[PDB]
């Protein structure tokens, strides 16, 4: 039988590209989404047209709260419900916006940025492990975590936390044969919305090709880490950044 | 006149050594605490006996919740209320206990305590500290073993990682306001009194420098340096004080 | 045309697996060796048996000296002369032995350890860049670089310098389309001079499976990095260590 | 009696600032130098004017070669010769210049100077320091806060500084049982070259979050002094950035 993967924030962009690739590799997929319901259903339709009964959606808010654990347990349950097994968890969903030190309340900023980037990945990881072949987890990290954007402190703390989870969980889950790794984009898939001037300025920063990563290039590193070619790899985070993190100010 | 400092978790152990040293250097101090009310009150008394009205206490749970932003703002407000200024913030308070990924606190409470105390409260205190504003600085108590974590301590470790991120992000963001932000990262310091000596010696044996743990005072020494005029160009730096422990392979 | 690769220290062990696996993937290979002449030549025979005119040998000492630049230049030249092109360089050759701070002279130890692990990599990189598709370099690093073996200061210095090179060369060669990455093993192929209690000691520290990596698992990561699935990856070092680097003392 | 320190490359700039501050704190100093003879002798002169028989100069090339081990042994021997003891070693001397991968110094010579001064000489001086030994023995290596965002075409320089990080770590671990601490100070930008144009200096200064200015020599020396002092007795294997936040800035 075919393996199954949960991908969070899989309706659009990088998450969708990862889902599409996992599916092309032979995986059945849970497409988790929060607000992008239409895109998610559309993607599941498209994947099931390709191989019937190989994709479902699963809606969940991944903001921190007292029910987040139940919500993460339900995401993993939903993969067992639809496919009888859960082989891969990809923690991709992420809030991202500035939170300067000097609309939203601070308690809400905390709950969204730390919840999505750190606490949900930990809770999904617990639920993944508890419900348990080549088992692994891939956390979408950030290659720029040690050269942070101005006024992104909560976002940065969450991606830092996610590094620590990758390491702690690689360590603790190894005795169960579950590998835990990360993929760290630099800049990838610019908002088609974003001004051409700013897009170009980001592109000019990148040593390798003066362009952003495609979503597919990020997906490719995910595919490697979950593959049989990465069986001895745990606790490793792979930058997919074209050298961006290496460039001095 | 004399500068002022807030030290969180300042009633006992490393926080207390930090407050005392800062006090000895001429600072007035806010001794924050949570449960150790007797220790905090006797510490303030000892210090005020030494110099009049140079120490006050401030109780607050730093678990993450909807009220944490107000509690943190009140901590900084207590410094201005007591002393008319707030020059230094030392984020030392920390919940520490295992949270296994696989098997009576609920996990959402463990999350709130471990990520609140170690990361979120630091961020909120930093916000209030900066908002309320010379040698201004913040020192965050980190952990030298953060990239070789203890088994079954994922939330604690996540909290300490997040705190490294905060140190960096805040150093960058507050640099234009002349606030430096640095870290001190102990390895093993002041082992629990309750821990058998024979258990303490298994930690001691791992330390290359002297086969022993750090004193509370040695940790405080790094804090005093970071807050001094000898460190005026230092920001975003995390100084390990671990006697080589983090260098030792398994 | 089939692409071509140079693997240093390729007669035995991990270099051999890398050569074999590159060859299996379609590459023509230069098998560099220092003292293992008989194994290099039988490896070449075996690969040419499989596909004719796809493997040659090149002997060189990679110790640091006044002639090291010309040696490295001639290694790269072997590949151009045999195969008309050089697409991949793998810097795998490495001296490794204790050099206590408190037999060989210390200057010899410096030359061997720093030469094999860093300066030869640097010169080979220069020669490779200068002679110039999917071009890349893969440096064999060490996952335990920040928790070094006692009394191994020069080896560790050399491996640190190799991280340095990986990073600097990634930045500098990105404009030419040359990627530069690293693979950092933990423990792999324990020596035979090693006792049973000693090997068991190492194996027991490895979280993922309580075992060393196979040479093939290390090679899997090299193949990935040189592949089209790593087109956006430069300056990245992938640990392949079963989580050994994460284990506190 | 007064402790003694060796400072490599101490005739001017950061090394002089370090030697000056150790001396003021009470140390006897070996001022090592390579080309700057006049500057070194003149510094020793001042320091001796301040306290008699507390400074000496010591000439050595720290380019890698087969005699470098003897040269490093002689540097340390010179401390014992003049002062009867050697408590502190500061590895400050450093060659710095580009070595582009793609294209009148030969590459041999580039490898020798950059890797010699930044790494191999520090290793050999550390060996000789430990070998020649209530004390406070330590080593401070001058590292580089930008070691993971290297300058274009500085590969040999960067390799050398990376190797120095490794030495700092390896030596801390190995020399701990002897009571010898080993730490690093990692400047960002400090003391801009003399002839650099106002335009270029401005561009560097504007990159620094804390104050938009390079570090003073004294600022770097402050961190060295901290690490050698009794306030750092449990500190080993640590590298303190003194960079005004520079290393945290993305491009
Ligand atoms: N793009 C880059 O340049 C870049 C750079 C560095 C790191 N990364 C990392 O790579 C991953 C993917 O990047 P991206 O640009 O594709 O991400 P994104 O578009 O910013 O976010 C992906 C998805 O996250 C989900 N999400 C946001 N808040 C959520 C909440 N409270 N609960 C549940 N789901 C939530 C959203 O789902 P709905 O749309 O369904 O609401 C969104 O579509 C992220 O982890 C990101 O941090 C990306
Ligand atoms: N000790 C070590 O070996 C070591 C190693 C690595 C890092 N560190 C770091 O150095 C710092 C000091 O270490 P330590 O061993 O002195 O710390 P600790 O004794 O474990 O805890 C410090 C104080 O934190 C306060 N605290 C705990 N939970 C709290 C909560 N929910 N709300 C508010 N305050 C709370 C407590 O106050 P009350 O007692 O008033 O309740 C406690 O006395 C910590 O940040 C620690 O993580 C220490
Ligand atoms: N094995 C591990 O657990 C481990 C762990 C960390 C890192 N690594 C790294 O992964 C790579 C492969 O490891 P390995 O154990 O397969 O390596 P290895 O057997 O120790 O050495 C590989 C080859 O290096 C060559 N070599 C040594 N000194 C040389 C010199 N002076 N000139 C030219 N060549 C020289 C030798 O070639 P000849 O046989 O032809 O003389 C040897 O076969 C190395 O870069 C190593 O540092 C390995
Ligand atoms: N300046 C900065 O912004 C900065 C930034 C990062 C790191 N650092 C580090 O901080 C330290 C001091 O920096 P700096 O700018 O003061 O250093 P520097 O002026 O570039 O060099 C200091 C001394 O090193 C000696 N030196 C050079 N080549 C030598 C050789 N072959 N043999 C022996 N000595 C040699 C020279 O001595 P003579 O003059 O006697 O010949 C020179 O005066 C260095 O280790 C440097 O890498 C500095
Ligand atoms: N979850 C998440 N999303 C990101 N970008 C998303 C782009 C679409 C709208 C939501 C934000 C980034 C970026 C990002 C990189 C370059 C850029 F020009 C803009 C944003 C860095 N980390 C990130 N994490
Ligand atoms: N907030 C906090 N507290 C810690 N230890 C405290 C010791 C007294 C009882 C509460 C725990 C550690 C330790 C710690 C190190 C060695 C040891 F044997 C036990 C605990 C590592 N980080 C820490 N953070
Ligand atoms: N070039 C090279 N060779 C290595 N091992 C080789 C083993 C065969 C004999 C030559 C040395 C190591 C090791 C190595 C790891 C675990 C172990 F138990 C023994 C040696 C770490 N880096 C290394 N680099
Ligand atoms: N030994 C050494 N020297 C350095 N600078 C010196 C400036 C005076 C003349 C020799 C070079 C640097 C610098 C340096 C920083 C900024 C700048 F604008 C120029 C050089 C970085 N590491 C270094 N190591």
PDB file of C-alpha atoms and ligand atoms in Angstrom, chain C residues 13 94-96 142 155 159 186-187 189-191 194 202, ligand 7:
ATOM      1  CA  UNK C  13      35.872   3.312   2.024  1.00  0.00           C
ATOM      2  CA  UNK C  94      41.751  13.372   4.561  1.00  0.00           C
ATOM      3  CA  UNK C  95      44.537  12.628   7.011  1.00  0.00           C
ATOM      4  CA  UNK C  96      43.257  11.892  10.510  1.00  0.00           C
ATOM      5  CA  UNK C 142      32.590  16.401   9.958  1.00  0.00           C
ATOM      6  CA  UNK C 155      42.419  17.720  12.192  1.00  0.00           C
ATOM      7  CA  UNK C 159      37.778  20.604   9.041  1.00  0.00           C
ATOM      8  CA  UNK C 186      29.304  11.377  12.186  1.00  0.00           C
ATOM      9  CA  UNK C 187      30.643   7.916  12.438  1.00  0.00           C
ATOM     10  CA  UNK C 189      32.878   2.401   8.638  1.00  0.00           C
ATOM     11  CA  UNK C 190      34.666   1.871  11.900  1.00  0.00           C
ATOM     12  CA  UNK C 191      38.330   0.840  11.447  1.00  0.00           C
ATOM     13  CA  UNK C 194      39.261  -0.939  16.539  1.00  0.00           C
ATOM     14  CA  UNK C 202      30.719   4.491  19.394  1.00  0.00           C
TER      15      UNK C 202
HETATM   16  N1  LIG E   7      39.766  11.008   7.282  1.00  0.00           N
HETATM   17  C1  LIG E   7      39.060  10.596   8.398  1.00  0.00           C
HETATM   18  N2  LIG E   7      39.095   9.300   8.811  1.00  0.00           N
HETATM   19  C2  LIG E   7      38.429   8.885   9.881  1.00  0.00           C
HETATM   20  N3  LIG E   7      38.587   7.461  10.168  1.00  0.00           N
HETATM   21  C3  LIG E   7      39.514   6.611   9.437  1.00  0.00           C
HETATM   22  C4  LIG E   7      39.255   5.196   9.817  1.00  0.00           C
HETATM   23  C5  LIG E   7      40.183   4.289   9.003  1.00  0.00           C
HETATM   24  C6  LIG E   7      41.654   4.590   9.271  1.00  0.00           C
HETATM   25  C7  LIG E   7      41.885   6.035   8.915  1.00  0.00           C
HETATM   26  C8  LIG E   7      40.974   6.904   9.746  1.00  0.00           C
HETATM   27  C9  LIG E   7      37.675   9.827  10.638  1.00  0.00           C
HETATM   28  C10 LIG E   7      36.931   9.667  11.708  1.00  0.00           C
HETATM   29  C11 LIG E   7      36.598   8.523  12.675  1.00  0.00           C
HETATM   30  C12 LIG E   7      35.305   8.398  13.349  1.00  0.00           C
HETATM   31  C13 LIG E   7      35.003   7.397  14.270  1.00  0.00           C
HETATM   32  C14 LIG E   7      35.885   6.545  14.616  1.00  0.00           C
HETATM   33  F1  LIG E   7      35.511   5.616  15.484  1.00  0.00           F
HETATM   34  C15 LIG E   7      37.122   6.559  14.144  1.00  0.00           C
HETATM   35  C16 LIG E   7      37.550   7.521  13.212  1.00  0.00           C
HETATM   36  C17 LIG E   7      36.398  10.897  12.033  1.00  0.00           C
HETATM   37  N4  LIG E   7      36.853  11.822  11.033  1.00  0.00           N
HETATM   38  C18 LIG E   7      37.675  11.093  10.187  1.00  0.00           C
HETATM   39  N5  LIG E   7      38.358  11.495   9.101  1.00  0.00           N
END
